């Protein structure tokens, strides 16, 4: 049962961290690990694999670690790594970390990801606030009887708080696709026609599950590339990884400052 | 085998209703269930749970009802309560009511549903004829070697007969999505771009199955809410049940008067 | 009844071994998959040195179309040894995508560097005629599926090699190109769905190819895609044609396109 597995996970988290309740959770995606160094000093770090119901992250740069971090009056559950629908897991396992974080007390989820830019004026390494999403997976993490409203799924209030730390932050609609193949240029033109600004392979189900469980969501993409058929700056793979790591390191400090309110 | 479970269901329907043949079937959506109280004078009520093929092996709670209702010269099979794709069951169970009804002689399927309104002229509590659909589920109820042309899937002839009962009935394109989450405002703007007037969580597979089985389809949406991000108010299942309950007597009357014209 | 879930790479290796043994050819550098309406193309490719039933190869689900569909032919074309798969299986038949893309993976394991993937399609774009062959410039995968599993990534830029389209147009410079929308099927589209597909940039609509292209690119093969327009899509206006006119136009185009592919492959 998803709710009971979430309650068991939250019990182990409380016991292993010695913290009764974490009021904020952060899921770090691909390219986001460098944010850890700037978020704060962890009081506990443990493998996700030792938590009930957690399929260990396997994607390159997903540590598969949970960090407990004090940030002002807040106790922040940091999930360094997530699992993806393209790994073949039932969506109940994909959204279990978010349900476990809610059961551990998290009222606000920061969901981070890597994304393709669908606009030629986005830059590799640019952080982009998620204004909304397009679920283009033909799936839901919810079952019969769970009829959840996704108006303001990405809290306007949280984007406003982020812009108090960096008022220049861009925003965009994130298209969640199944993957794991990348898009054809014709698919990228279609996504622009459907009103998407960003493309990736996570987040939409985690957002739906977070809203169904009564949590507010702040979504942040790191643009790792311009999407198929959009020509962008000639960068080496080292320049792409370096630009991403520098933004992820800066965004850790920004998230710490925003969470601290 | 879907066709054989349909045939066995039709045999039991004939035996328990004492009616050899039903020429019309009505599927009542969430938001149309209360209309069963106001749709003619039912002579027989059968539990779907006692009919072959109706309940998925891992079905949740109690199955629905089937009623036999005389409406004009017609004997109507009314399916009160249905299986949705969002419950996770094979689409054979979503479309079994349509296939069982066809095997019992139904040449016309009235498929009803609740919908979010996208087109500006469509109001909460308005019945809307379905002109066409967008299947946005990436699924089909048909298996290999079952082909069907979906040109005029929603019989123009039946929409014209409905308009003899109420000549001001609007019509719109219905987008069938998986659900059960409601849409983001961004997804609603996308659906407007793709030409949807209505959004919901049923019907598209039942329509495909009906056409494949040789039945004509009338689709009727009740607008239970404006689509996400139009008012800015959140959406709830309570709105669908509330709009259905309030409209039940009107919608029952409409379905009776339209079916009488078939 | 149970699906054994064989490992794709090993099933492809074993299939390529049986293909080498039964054809007496160690390597096939080109593969051709002939879709619906494409059987007339077979004779113009050349004289086959081996013909065998697909069903006798490991991992091959037999195509449902019988006769000369469901065959593998080994055909010499210039300096090349060409693996011709007459018929395919479809996602609508309900099989796991590993079976849908297994023929392409088996062909790659037998040495195929280039895949020619042909299909039937409905025409959306105003200029397209029933019977017209159309080069695939790009695709829209509208199935919400992938034939790739966790950790397998592929860039689908130029999935349909511009080089191979240019070689096809050297053999017949009037060949049109268009974007193929791959749908699950097996129902055909409503007119409203077809107006949607036009908005999303599709010129052609069918029930195959997209997963085979993804699997081909992931395995390192170049792809040439060709649609035969068998019908105008739902709601698309055109001259009324009889069933006989439609079928005859297709068969004559398939014959010509067989000769064109023989000439193009000789220049690969
Ligand atoms: O162009 C692009 N198309 C589609 N997806 C992307 C991504 S995200 C991505 C891609 C492959 C694997 C994992 C990914 O994300 C993991 P997560 O951060 O969401 O946990 C970047 N660029 C593109
Ligand atoms: O705005 C909307 N978006 C998407 N679906 C809807 C529905 S339908 C619906 C909603 C909740 C639960 C079940 C529903 O369908 C059952 P049925 O009537 O088709 O049997 C109304 N409004 C919207
Ligand atoms: O209008 C159309 N809509 C959608 N699909 C089509 C097809 S393809 C097709 C249809 C039924 C069965 C199989 C099919 O594909 C065979 P293949 O050549 O890809 O192996 C033609 N016309 C339309």
Numbering used by the authors:
A (entry chain B): 7 to 266, 269
B (entry chain A): 7 to 268
C (entry chain C): 1 to 268
Task: Copy text from the publication.
Purine nucleoside phosphorylases (PNPs, EC 2.4.2.1) are cytosolic enzymes involved in the purine salvage pathway metabolism in most organisms. The enzyme degrades (2′-deoxy)nucleosides based on 6-oxopurines to the corresponding purine bases and (2-deoxy)ribose-1-phosphate. Purine nucleoside phosphorylase (PNP) is a well-known molecular target with potential therapeutic applications in the treatment of T-cell malignancies and/or bacterial/parasitic infections.
To obtain information on the binding pose and interacting residues, crystal structures of recombinant MtPNP in complex with inhibitors 18c, 45b, and 45q were determined and refined to high resolution. Inhibitors 18c, 45b, and 45q bind to the active site of MtPNP through eight direct and three water-mediated hydrogen bonds. Purine moiety forms direct hydrogen bonds with the sidechains of Glu189, two bonds with Asn231, and a water-mediated bond with the amine group of the Ala234 main chain. Central phenyl moiety interacts with a pocket formed by Tyr188, His243, and Phe153 sidechain belonging to the neighboring molecule within the enzyme trimer. Phosphonate moiety forms five potential direct hydrogen bonds with side chains of Arg88, His90, and Ser208, the main chain of Ser36 and Ala120, and two water-mediated hydrogen bonds with the main chain of Met207 and Tyr180. A preliminary in vitro screening revealed that compounds 18b and 18c exhibited low nanomolar inhibitory activities against hPNP (IC50 = 0.021 and 0.022 μM, respectively) and MtPNP (0.025 and 0.031 μM, respectively). All crystallization experiments were performed at 18 °C. The crystal of MtPNP with 18c was obtained using the sitting-drop vapor diffusion technique set by Orynx8 robot (Douglas Instruments) in Swissci 96-well 3-drop plates (Molecular Dimensions). The reservoir solution of 30 μL volume contained 0.2 M magnesium chloride, 30% v/v PEG400, 1 mM Tellurium-Centered Anderson–Evans Polyoxotungstate (TEW), 0.1 M HEPES pH 7.5,54 and drop volume 300 nL, made by mixing equal volumes of the sample and precipitate. Needle crystal, dimensions 300 × 30 × 30 μm appeared after 3 weeks and were harvested after 1 week.
